[PDB]
Amino acid sequence: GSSAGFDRHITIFSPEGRLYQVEYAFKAINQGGLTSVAVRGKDCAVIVTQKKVPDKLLDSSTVTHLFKITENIGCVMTGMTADSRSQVQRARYEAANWKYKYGYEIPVDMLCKRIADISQVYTQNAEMRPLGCCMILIGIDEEQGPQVYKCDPAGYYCGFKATAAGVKQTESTSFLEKKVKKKFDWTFEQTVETAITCLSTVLSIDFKPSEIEVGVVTVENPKFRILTEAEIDAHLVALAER
Amino acid sequence: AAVVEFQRAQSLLSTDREASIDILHSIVKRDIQENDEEAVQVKEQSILELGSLLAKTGQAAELGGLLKYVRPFLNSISKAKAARLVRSLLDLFLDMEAATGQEVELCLECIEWAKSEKRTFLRQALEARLVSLYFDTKRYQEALHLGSQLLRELKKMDDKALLVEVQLLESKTYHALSNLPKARAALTSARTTANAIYCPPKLQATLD
Amino acid sequence: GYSFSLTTFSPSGKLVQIEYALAAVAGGAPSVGIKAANGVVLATEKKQKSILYDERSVHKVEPITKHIGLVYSGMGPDYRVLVHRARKLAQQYYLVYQEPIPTAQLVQRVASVMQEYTQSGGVRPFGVSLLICGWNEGRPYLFQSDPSGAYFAWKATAMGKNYVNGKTFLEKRYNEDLELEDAIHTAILTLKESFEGQMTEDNIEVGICNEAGFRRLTPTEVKDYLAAIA
Amino acid sequence: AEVKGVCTEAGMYALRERRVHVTQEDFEMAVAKVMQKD
Amino acid sequence: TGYDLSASTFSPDGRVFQVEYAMKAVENSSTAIGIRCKDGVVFGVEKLVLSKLYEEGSNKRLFNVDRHVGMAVAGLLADARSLADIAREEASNFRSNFGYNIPLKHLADRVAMYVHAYTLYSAVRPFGCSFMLGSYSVNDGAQLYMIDPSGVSYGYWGCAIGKARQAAKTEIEKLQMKEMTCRDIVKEVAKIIYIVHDEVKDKAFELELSWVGELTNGRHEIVPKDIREEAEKYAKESLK
Amino acid sequence: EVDYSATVDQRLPECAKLAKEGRLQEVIETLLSLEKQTRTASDMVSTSRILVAVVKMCYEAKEWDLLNENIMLLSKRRSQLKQAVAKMVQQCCTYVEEITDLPIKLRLIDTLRMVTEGKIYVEIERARLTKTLATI
Amino acid sequence: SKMNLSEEVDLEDYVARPDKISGADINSICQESGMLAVRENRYIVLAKDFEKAYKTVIKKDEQEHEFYK
């Protein structure tokens, strides 16, 4: 943990080879206090996050961390709300530019690979700070199938069978690692159930059909849709009955 | 096509082992077209399974003759797969203690294949195994000649783990020749080489 | 943007920020490159911290042209930037000469980019070292590009974590008469000494270059090579 | 110091075999332990 | 400690102090409340007069960024006016490009990104004002968004920004805002402002009122003086 | 807790008549739903009575394959009360003594000795079953 | 060796883990595995107890970001 100069104030290397500013951006994801869980099945991908409405004054229809980047690609944002919208707006622009320049919908893997490239510049140039947000894109590829990609402030990116971001990321990761070890190609119903269960078990909330948001993409309909409270209640009822 | 008989051979595993052989061995005789990325993968899986089954049945003609028959096929699959095939087929025959009398012959044939394919690491372990086979066949004089050559090659590349084994074989061979002073020197070489590296429990046991 | 250099000379005549960038390289995943007589091999430890990670989603060994490949040790995001720059640089060479870019020429162009970030304003050096392998004029090529921007022609080298002992291991295990397949065997052996746990076909990445060009070995192929180790 | 430690370890190997006189094997086994192992 | 001198440096706990410090300027200004009723949005700002010399209308915290969108500000007034011009030019550009009045959701999402762009670099400082944007249309309906110095835009039914925001929010929660109309809300908005005002503390406030709803044909206008005085009288009577 | 009690006092005699009539597969499912309610409610005196009822139902109906499957399924049920299983095993080991057919008796013991393996609260039944198995 | 285990537990699953743990940590894993069996009124330690015990005892925060390698 040695320091020499401005290694803690700008994105420059520490004596042991560390970028503290980039590391501090990771602790910024937990500032919102929300956890997101994404699970990929045999033919579907599901993103689940908790929505907190502290007062009835807030319009709950607006407090959403689920964003439709394009028709076939959706994402869940964790971290600073202000930084999250900029990444979503940036991701939407790159998706639209890819469609215009190349003539086909941008792949999920290449969407963050661009976004991780933008966020890498923030970790190399010192006049701006890294965006304290985490991006998890889910979408149905033409050939590879369902895809899940986490997109961290450091410019790192990787595919995931089931990932999580937020305060309870490592608690939820251990839960999802156990479920994946069983090696079950979950159906659409099971992926939503394990995604809701992962957020439910880790947080111990026993979710109501107003406290989480579910966004799913399926092979049958490769479009990103937000689950309504009626649709979300069916899965919660199914969880309770089993 | 060919995959179906593999499951049928797998299903026949619960049945008589020899009954399953006719399925796998027919695939082994089966001729192949230019590439057949599925067929060669099945035959490679069948031949590895066929030899594995014969490790329990113990039939030298179909096992020892297999290695002499599949030499043309080794020129089709990738070199990494072929070297594994040669290693696996040879290892099963020699782990079978039955001294059919040709154990020296095909081991030397594989060494020639290793020389032709320029696989030094595969060759060196085969030569080291041959020295053990020479010792087990009372061929002490040739064992020392091959062990002496392997000692120099192993020393240059600092392969201490394999150096200990061949040195121990030299110590055992000299002991059988009733030459205690040379047996102690070879064992001294093996012990000092062993002390310089981490000895696996099998290697420490044979040294002790 | 900041117009002043963030890398400066220490009173004892050292670019201190470059040395700290090299420390990040030493903390990265090990990468081993061996130049055999008939080709070059590139191997690295692509081990993830969980099974949830998709191994095949992100590849540490990436091709640049039909005959040039990259493998790194250091910061993952920094390597993707250098991959795009190298691929951009290879296209610029190809467009104006209509000939695939020589392996040596690419290293100079890539190292120049790395050197620029040492002297340019408001930026930090790349925290990676690039192992560049290629095939030109019927002769194998292997190079290393440090964060400083200095490129070395290596017959056999290792970078990343435990690279000092890996270099020593290659000293006693490499000769100019090694073949491509034995180089793969030696490259896997070099990783194994620095490797913790067990090496599967998914937690390591191997890429080789020969007359046929550079291609990254599939997990099926790496499994066959790994079987010879044990 | 390493050369001195090799001699001290050489006498240890004689004790491990309950010998009184240090033999050449003991020095060689001490060299391997001090240099290569450590 | 040096971790709070720039917006481009993260605290070791991952918080941007310059943005947090800019939020404190909003918490030092007078409260400004906005309530979204069934058929519109009513804006009420407690506008103190620092001296009797300022004219009735000086330091107008209620702006008109478009013919259908209002703006109630809190914090530093200069950055509030600058953001009002940014919101003004965002609505003008939207009409000059797409051909219709800009939706509040897009306007809030557009101005917030400009606000957020000032929270990333050391070359600029975060805006020291928080503002509420309200609009009404027959199609979209009454909308109310609050944007803080960080750049977070959330839709609201009742929002308060300023030093008495926390006390004002409690009074807003009593209201059944989803059912009453603008004419009834303007009385309550005055009542909440008068309740949260501190007479022993900074006193002599002027009640600034504005609304946009179906009664104004979706046009943001200053509340008429005749209704405004009626709301003022009701608020004063409610204090007994 | 919720004290189901009399709730199972109504179902158990009713499903007993359907069991003799010929309805067993549908009946046990109704008890399984009733067991699920009582298990979650942690009703001890209730949950035992269904568990002994199902094993008795499959024993009186000579449903040996169903009896062994039900024993394994009931014992592995999520968060099942430990004393509820003890009563079910206690009533089941009595059926072992009554059963004279060796292949049927052996398989029931093997299933019973497997659901009681490693569990303290049924250690006496497992020992006694091993003595019965050893005697056989 | 002093504990009543089941044949279903494979110690190599937890030995192969790359966690840098001490002998007291390994004792705690076995000690915590035995208490989970005790909690469920069991005198034989199952494989599920060891998996829960290992996760509880180690409780290792990642403390390392993937972008460094």
PDB file of N, CA and C in Angstrom, chain B residues 77-145:
ATOM      1  N   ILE B  77      -3.840 -37.652 -37.646  1.00  0.00           N
ATOM      2  CA  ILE B  77      -4.255 -36.801 -36.536  1.00  0.00           C
ATOM      3  C   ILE B  77      -3.139 -35.825 -36.193  1.00  0.00           C
ATOM      4  N   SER B  78      -3.454 -34.828 -35.369  1.00  0.00           N
ATOM      5  CA  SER B  78      -2.468 -33.837 -34.971  1.00  0.00           C
ATOM      6  C   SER B  78      -1.374 -34.478 -34.122  1.00  0.00           C
ATOM      7  N   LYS B  79      -0.193 -33.857 -34.154  1.00  0.00           N
ATOM      8  CA  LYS B  79       0.972 -34.430 -33.485  1.00  0.00           C
ATOM      9  C   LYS B  79       0.749 -34.553 -31.984  1.00  0.00           C
ATOM     10  N   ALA B  80       0.040 -33.592 -31.387  1.00  0.00           N
ATOM     11  CA  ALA B  80      -0.261 -33.677 -29.962  1.00  0.00           C
ATOM     12  C   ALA B  80      -1.125 -34.893 -29.654  1.00  0.00           C
ATOM     13  N   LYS B  81      -2.132 -35.151 -30.489  1.00  0.00           N
ATOM     14  CA  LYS B  81      -2.985 -36.316 -30.284  1.00  0.00           C
ATOM     15  C   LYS B  81      -2.233 -37.611 -30.566  1.00  0.00           C
ATOM     16  N   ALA B  82      -1.398 -37.618 -31.607  1.00  0.00           N
ATOM     17  CA  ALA B  82      -0.667 -38.828 -31.969  1.00  0.00           C
ATOM     18  C   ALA B  82       0.320 -39.226 -30.879  1.00  0.00           C
ATOM     19  N   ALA B  83       1.041 -38.248 -30.325  1.00  0.00           N
ATOM     20  CA  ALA B  83       1.983 -38.544 -29.250  1.00  0.00           C
ATOM     21  C   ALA B  83       1.263 -39.078 -28.020  1.00  0.00           C
ATOM     22  N   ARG B  84       0.096 -38.515 -27.705  1.00  0.00           N
ATOM     23  CA  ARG B  84      -0.713 -39.046 -26.614  1.00  0.00           C
ATOM     24  C   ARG B  84      -1.170 -40.467 -26.916  1.00  0.00           C
ATOM     25  N   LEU B  85      -1.548 -40.732 -28.169  1.00  0.00           N
ATOM     26  CA  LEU B  85      -1.968 -42.077 -28.551  1.00  0.00           C
ATOM     27  C   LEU B  85      -0.830 -43.078 -28.405  1.00  0.00           C
ATOM     28  N   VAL B  86       0.370 -42.709 -28.859  1.00  0.00           N
ATOM     29  CA  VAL B  86       1.526 -43.591 -28.719  1.00  0.00           C
ATOM     30  C   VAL B  86       1.836 -43.822 -27.246  1.00  0.00           C
ATOM     31  N   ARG B  87       1.806 -42.750 -26.453  1.00  0.00           N
ATOM     32  CA  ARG B  87       2.077 -42.865 -25.024  1.00  0.00           C
ATOM     33  C   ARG B  87       1.050 -43.753 -24.335  1.00  0.00           C
ATOM     34  N   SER B  88      -0.237 -43.501 -24.589  1.00  0.00           N
ATOM     35  CA  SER B  88      -1.288 -44.248 -23.904  1.00  0.00           C
ATOM     36  C   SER B  88      -1.267 -45.722 -24.286  1.00  0.00           C
ATOM     37  N   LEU B  89      -1.124 -46.020 -25.580  1.00  0.00           N
ATOM     38  CA  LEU B  89      -1.101 -47.411 -26.019  1.00  0.00           C
ATOM     39  C   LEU B  89       0.114 -48.143 -25.463  1.00  0.00           C
ATOM     40  N   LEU B  90       1.279 -47.493 -25.482  1.00  0.00           N
ATOM     41  CA  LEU B  90       2.484 -48.130 -24.963  1.00  0.00           C
ATOM     42  C   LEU B  90       2.407 -48.302 -23.450  1.00  0.00           C
ATOM     43  N   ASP B  91       1.871 -47.303 -22.744  1.00  0.00           N
ATOM     44  CA  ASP B  91       1.831 -47.365 -21.287  1.00  0.00           C
ATOM     45  C   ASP B  91       0.969 -48.519 -20.797  1.00  0.00           C
ATOM     46  N   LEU B  92      -0.129 -48.810 -21.494  1.00  0.00           N
ATOM     47  CA  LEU B  92      -1.000 -49.907 -21.091  1.00  0.00           C
ATOM     48  C   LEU B  92      -0.336 -51.266 -21.274  1.00  0.00           C
ATOM     49  N   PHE B  93       0.418 -51.448 -22.360  1.00  0.00           N
ATOM     50  CA  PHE B  93       1.113 -52.712 -22.575  1.00  0.00           C
ATOM     51  C   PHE B  93       2.165 -52.957 -21.500  1.00  0.00           C
ATOM     52  N   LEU B  94       2.917 -51.919 -21.128  1.00  0.00           N
ATOM     53  CA  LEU B  94       4.034 -52.118 -20.210  1.00  0.00           C
ATOM     54  C   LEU B  94       3.573 -52.114 -18.758  1.00  0.00           C
ATOM     55  N   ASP B  95       2.475 -51.417 -18.454  1.00  0.00           N
ATOM     56  CA  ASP B  95       1.867 -51.577 -17.138  1.00  0.00           C
ATOM     57  C   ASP B  95       1.248 -52.958 -16.981  1.00  0.00           C
ATOM     58  N   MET B  96       0.945 -53.625 -18.093  1.00  0.00           N
ATOM     59  CA  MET B  96       0.593 -55.040 -18.063  1.00  0.00           C
ATOM     60  C   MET B  96       1.873 -55.851 -17.919  1.00  0.00           C
ATOM     61  N   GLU B  97       2.064 -56.466 -16.752  1.00  0.00           N
ATOM     62  CA  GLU B  97       3.329 -57.119 -16.435  1.00  0.00           C
ATOM     63  C   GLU B  97       3.597 -58.353 -17.286  1.00  0.00           C
ATOM     64  N   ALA B  98       2.609 -58.840 -18.036  1.00  0.00           N
ATOM     65  CA  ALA B  98       2.789 -60.017 -18.876  1.00  0.00           C
ATOM     66  C   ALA B  98       3.906 -59.801 -19.889  1.00  0.00           C
ATOM     67  N   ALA B  99       5.003 -60.544 -19.738  1.00  0.00           N
ATOM     68  CA  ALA B  99       6.164 -60.411 -20.616  1.00  0.00           C
ATOM     69  C   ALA B  99       5.947 -61.280 -21.851  1.00  0.00           C
ATOM     70  N   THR B 100       5.280 -60.693 -22.846  1.00  0.00           N
ATOM     71  CA  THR B 100       5.015 -61.398 -24.094  1.00  0.00           C
ATOM     72  C   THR B 100       6.257 -61.553 -24.960  1.00  0.00           C
ATOM     73  N   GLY B 101       7.351 -60.870 -24.629  1.00  0.00           N
ATOM     74  CA  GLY B 101       8.606 -61.018 -25.332  1.00  0.00           C
ATOM     75  C   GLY B 101       8.901 -59.947 -26.359  1.00  0.00           C
ATOM     76  N   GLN B 102       7.891 -59.217 -26.827  1.00  0.00           N
ATOM     77  CA  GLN B 102       8.096 -58.142 -27.787  1.00  0.00           C
ATOM     78  C   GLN B 102       8.042 -56.766 -27.141  1.00  0.00           C
ATOM     79  N   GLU B 103       8.038 -56.697 -25.807  1.00  0.00           N
ATOM     80  CA  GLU B 103       7.941 -55.408 -25.128  1.00  0.00           C
ATOM     81  C   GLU B 103       9.118 -54.509 -25.480  1.00  0.00           C
ATOM     82  N   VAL B 104      10.309 -55.089 -25.614  1.00  0.00           N
ATOM     83  CA  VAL B 104      11.468 -54.313 -26.040  1.00  0.00           C
ATOM     84  C   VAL B 104      11.286 -53.824 -27.472  1.00  0.00           C
ATOM     85  N   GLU B 105      10.712 -54.665 -28.337  1.00  0.00           N
ATOM     86  CA  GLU B 105      10.684 -54.365 -29.765  1.00  0.00           C
ATOM     87  C   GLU B 105       9.838 -53.133 -30.072  1.00  0.00           C
ATOM     88  N   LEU B 106       8.588 -53.105 -29.601  1.00  0.00           N
ATOM     89  CA  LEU B 106       7.720 -51.989 -29.966  1.00  0.00           C
ATOM     90  C   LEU B 106       8.077 -50.724 -29.197  1.00  0.00           C
ATOM     91  N   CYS B 107       8.661 -50.867 -28.005  1.00  0.00           N
ATOM     92  CA  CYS B 107       9.179 -49.700 -27.299  1.00  0.00           C
ATOM     93  C   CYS B 107      10.287 -49.032 -28.101  1.00  0.00           C
ATOM     94  N   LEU B 108      11.163 -49.832 -28.714  1.00  0.00           N
ATOM     95  CA  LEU B 108      12.173 -49.276 -29.604  1.00  0.00           C
ATOM     96  C   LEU B 108      11.547 -48.709 -30.871  1.00  0.00           C
ATOM     97  N   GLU B 109      10.461 -49.321 -31.351  1.00  0.00           N
ATOM     98  CA  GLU B 109       9.759 -48.785 -32.512  1.00  0.00           C
ATOM     99  C   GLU B 109       9.188 -47.405 -32.222  1.00  0.00           C
ATOM    100  N   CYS B 110       8.615 -47.218 -31.030  1.00  0.00           N
ATOM    101  CA  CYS B 110       8.106 -45.904 -30.652  1.00  0.00           C
ATOM    102  C   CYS B 110       9.228 -44.887 -30.506  1.00  0.00           C
ATOM    103  N   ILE B 111      10.394 -45.320 -30.023  1.00  0.00           N
ATOM    104  CA  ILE B 111      11.542 -44.423 -29.937  1.00  0.00           C
ATOM    105  C   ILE B 111      11.941 -43.945 -31.325  1.00  0.00           C
ATOM    106  N   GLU B 112      11.940 -44.852 -32.305  1.00  0.00           N
ATOM    107  CA  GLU B 112      12.208 -44.454 -33.682  1.00  0.00           C
ATOM    108  C   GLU B 112      11.140 -43.496 -34.194  1.00  0.00           C
ATOM    109  N   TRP B 113       9.879 -43.732 -33.826  1.00  0.00           N
ATOM    110  CA  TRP B 113       8.822 -42.794 -34.188  1.00  0.00           C
ATOM    111  C   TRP B 113       9.047 -41.437 -33.536  1.00  0.00           C
ATOM    112  N   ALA B 114       9.470 -41.434 -32.270  1.00  0.00           N
ATOM    113  CA  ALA B 114       9.765 -40.178 -31.591  1.00  0.00           C
ATOM    114  C   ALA B 114      10.923 -39.449 -32.260  1.00  0.00           C
ATOM    115  N   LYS B 115      11.956 -40.187 -32.672  1.00  0.00           N
ATOM    116  CA  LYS B 115      13.064 -39.568 -33.394  1.00  0.00           C
ATOM    117  C   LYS B 115      12.603 -39.003 -34.730  1.00  0.00           C
ATOM    118  N   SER B 116      11.760 -39.748 -35.450  1.00  0.00           N
ATOM    119  CA  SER B 116      11.250 -39.265 -36.729  1.00  0.00           C
ATOM    120  C   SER B 116      10.397 -38.018 -36.546  1.00  0.00           C
ATOM    121  N   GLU B 117       9.567 -37.994 -35.507  1.00  0.00           N
ATOM    122  CA  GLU B 117       8.712 -36.851 -35.222  1.00  0.00           C
ATOM    123  C   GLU B 117       9.418 -35.774 -34.411  1.00  0.00           C
ATOM    124  N   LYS B 118      10.678 -35.999 -34.033  1.00  0.00           N
ATOM    125  CA  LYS B 118      11.491 -35.017 -33.315  1.00  0.00           C
ATOM    126  C   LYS B 118      10.823 -34.575 -32.014  1.00  0.00           C
ATOM    127  N   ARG B 119      10.252 -35.541 -31.298  1.00  0.00           N
ATOM    128  CA  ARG B 119       9.657 -35.298 -29.984  1.00  0.00           C
ATOM    129  C   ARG B 119      10.653 -35.780 -28.935  1.00  0.00           C
ATOM    130  N   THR B 120      11.555 -34.880 -28.534  1.00  0.00           N
ATOM    131  CA  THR B 120      12.613 -35.250 -27.599  1.00  0.00           C
ATOM    132  C   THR B 120      12.050 -35.635 -26.239  1.00  0.00           C
ATOM    133  N   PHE B 121      11.066 -34.881 -25.745  1.00  0.00           N
ATOM    134  CA  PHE B 121      10.518 -35.158 -24.421  1.00  0.00           C
ATOM    135  C   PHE B 121       9.795 -36.498 -24.391  1.00  0.00           C
ATOM    136  N   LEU B 122       9.050 -36.818 -25.451  1.00  0.00           N
ATOM    137  CA  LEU B 122       8.412 -38.127 -25.531  1.00  0.00           C
ATOM    138  C   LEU B 122       9.447 -39.237 -25.661  1.00  0.00           C
ATOM    139  N   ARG B 123      10.477 -39.019 -26.481  1.00  0.00           N
ATOM    140  CA  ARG B 123      11.522 -40.023 -26.653  1.00  0.00           C
ATOM    141  C   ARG B 123      12.233 -40.318 -25.342  1.00  0.00           C
ATOM    142  N   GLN B 124      12.581 -39.270 -24.594  1.00  0.00           N
ATOM    143  CA  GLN B 124      13.408 -39.440 -23.407  1.00  0.00           C
ATOM    144  C   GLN B 124      12.704 -40.290 -22.358  1.00  0.00           C
ATOM    145  N   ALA B 125      11.394 -40.102 -22.196  1.00  0.00           N
ATOM    146  CA  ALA B 125      10.646 -40.930 -21.258  1.00  0.00           C
ATOM    147  C   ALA B 125      10.496 -42.354 -21.777  1.00  0.00           C
ATOM    148  N   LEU B 126      10.366 -42.518 -23.096  1.00  0.00           N
ATOM    149  CA  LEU B 126      10.314 -43.861 -23.670  1.00  0.00           C
ATOM    150  C   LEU B 126      11.637 -44.594 -23.488  1.00  0.00           C
ATOM    151  N   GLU B 127      12.759 -43.903 -23.700  1.00  0.00           N
ATOM    152  CA  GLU B 127      14.059 -44.520 -23.454  1.00  0.00           C
ATOM    153  C   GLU B 127      14.232 -44.868 -21.982  1.00  0.00           C
ATOM    154  N   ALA B 128      13.786 -43.981 -21.087  1.00  0.00           N
ATOM    155  CA  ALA B 128      13.849 -44.276 -19.660  1.00  0.00           C
ATOM    156  C   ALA B 128      13.000 -45.485 -19.306  1.00  0.00           C
ATOM    157  N   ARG B 129      11.820 -45.602 -19.914  1.00  0.00           N
ATOM    158  CA  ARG B 129      10.997 -46.788 -19.713  1.00  0.00           C
ATOM    159  C   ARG B 129      11.666 -48.027 -20.297  1.00  0.00           C
ATOM    160  N   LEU B 130      12.363 -47.872 -21.426  1.00  0.00           N
ATOM    161  CA  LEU B 130      13.059 -49.004 -22.034  1.00  0.00           C
ATOM    162  C   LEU B 130      14.156 -49.538 -21.121  1.00  0.00           C
ATOM    163  N   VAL B 131      14.864 -48.648 -20.421  1.00  0.00           N
ATOM    164  CA  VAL B 131      15.904 -49.089 -19.496  1.00  0.00           C
ATOM    165  C   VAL B 131      15.307 -49.970 -18.408  1.00  0.00           C
ATOM    166  N   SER B 132      14.135 -49.590 -17.895  1.00  0.00           N
ATOM    167  CA  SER B 132      13.442 -50.440 -16.934  1.00  0.00           C
ATOM    168  C   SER B 132      13.050 -51.768 -17.565  1.00  0.00           C
ATOM    169  N   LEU B 133      12.593 -51.736 -18.817  1.00  0.00           N
ATOM    170  CA  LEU B 133      12.239 -52.970 -19.508  1.00  0.00           C
ATOM    171  C   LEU B 133      13.468 -53.837 -19.744  1.00  0.00           C
ATOM    172  N   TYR B 134      14.604 -53.209 -20.059  1.00  0.00           N
ATOM    173  CA  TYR B 134      15.849 -53.955 -20.209  1.00  0.00           C
ATOM    174  C   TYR B 134      16.243 -54.631 -18.902  1.00  0.00           C
ATOM    175  N   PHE B 135      16.090 -53.923 -17.781  1.00  0.00           N
ATOM    176  CA  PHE B 135      16.407 -54.502 -16.480  1.00  0.00           C
ATOM    177  C   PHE B 135      15.500 -55.685 -16.163  1.00  0.00           C
ATOM    178  N   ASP B 136      14.207 -55.561 -16.462  1.00  0.00           N
ATOM    179  CA  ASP B 136      13.251 -56.630 -16.198  1.00  0.00           C
ATOM    180  C   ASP B 136      13.439 -57.835 -17.109  1.00  0.00           C
ATOM    181  N   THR B 137      14.142 -57.679 -18.229  1.00  0.00           N
ATOM    182  CA  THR B 137      14.389 -58.767 -19.168  1.00  0.00           C
ATOM    183  C   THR B 137      15.806 -59.314 -19.029  1.00  0.00           C
ATOM    184  N   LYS B 138      16.448 -59.064 -17.889  1.00  0.00           N
ATOM    185  CA  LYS B 138      17.815 -59.484 -17.594  1.00  0.00           C
ATOM    186  C   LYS B 138      18.827 -58.942 -18.594  1.00  0.00           C
ATOM    187  N   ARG B 139      18.493 -57.864 -19.299  1.00  0.00           N
ATOM    188  CA  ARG B 139      19.392 -57.274 -20.290  1.00  0.00           C
ATOM    189  C   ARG B 139      20.141 -56.109 -19.644  1.00  0.00           C
ATOM    190  N   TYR B 140      21.010 -56.464 -18.696  1.00  0.00           N
ATOM    191  CA  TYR B 140      21.665 -55.450 -17.878  1.00  0.00           C
ATOM    192  C   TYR B 140      22.682 -54.653 -18.684  1.00  0.00           C
ATOM    193  N   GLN B 141      23.409 -55.320 -19.584  1.00  0.00           N
ATOM    194  CA  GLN B 141      24.461 -54.646 -20.338  1.00  0.00           C
ATOM    195  C   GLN B 141      23.891 -53.576 -21.262  1.00  0.00           C
ATOM    196  N   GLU B 142      22.802 -53.883 -21.971  1.00  0.00           N
ATOM    197  CA  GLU B 142      22.195 -52.874 -22.834  1.00  0.00           C
ATOM    198  C   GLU B 142      21.491 -51.797 -22.019  1.00  0.00           C
ATOM    199  N   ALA B 143      21.001 -52.148 -20.828  1.00  0.00           N
ATOM    200  CA  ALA B 143      20.367 -51.154 -19.968  1.00  0.00           C
ATOM    201  C   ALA B 143      21.354 -50.066 -19.564  1.00  0.00           C
ATOM    202  N   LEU B 144      22.585 -50.454 -19.224  1.00  0.00           N
ATOM    203  CA  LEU B 144      23.600 -49.466 -18.876  1.00  0.00           C
ATOM    204  C   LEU B 144      23.958 -48.595 -20.073  1.00  0.00           C
ATOM    205  N   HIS B 145      24.050 -49.195 -21.262  1.00  0.00           N
ATOM    206  CA  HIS B 145      24.402 -48.433 -22.456  1.00  0.00           C
ATOM    207  C   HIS B 145      23.347 -47.376 -22.765  1.00  0.00           C
TER     208      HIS B 145
END
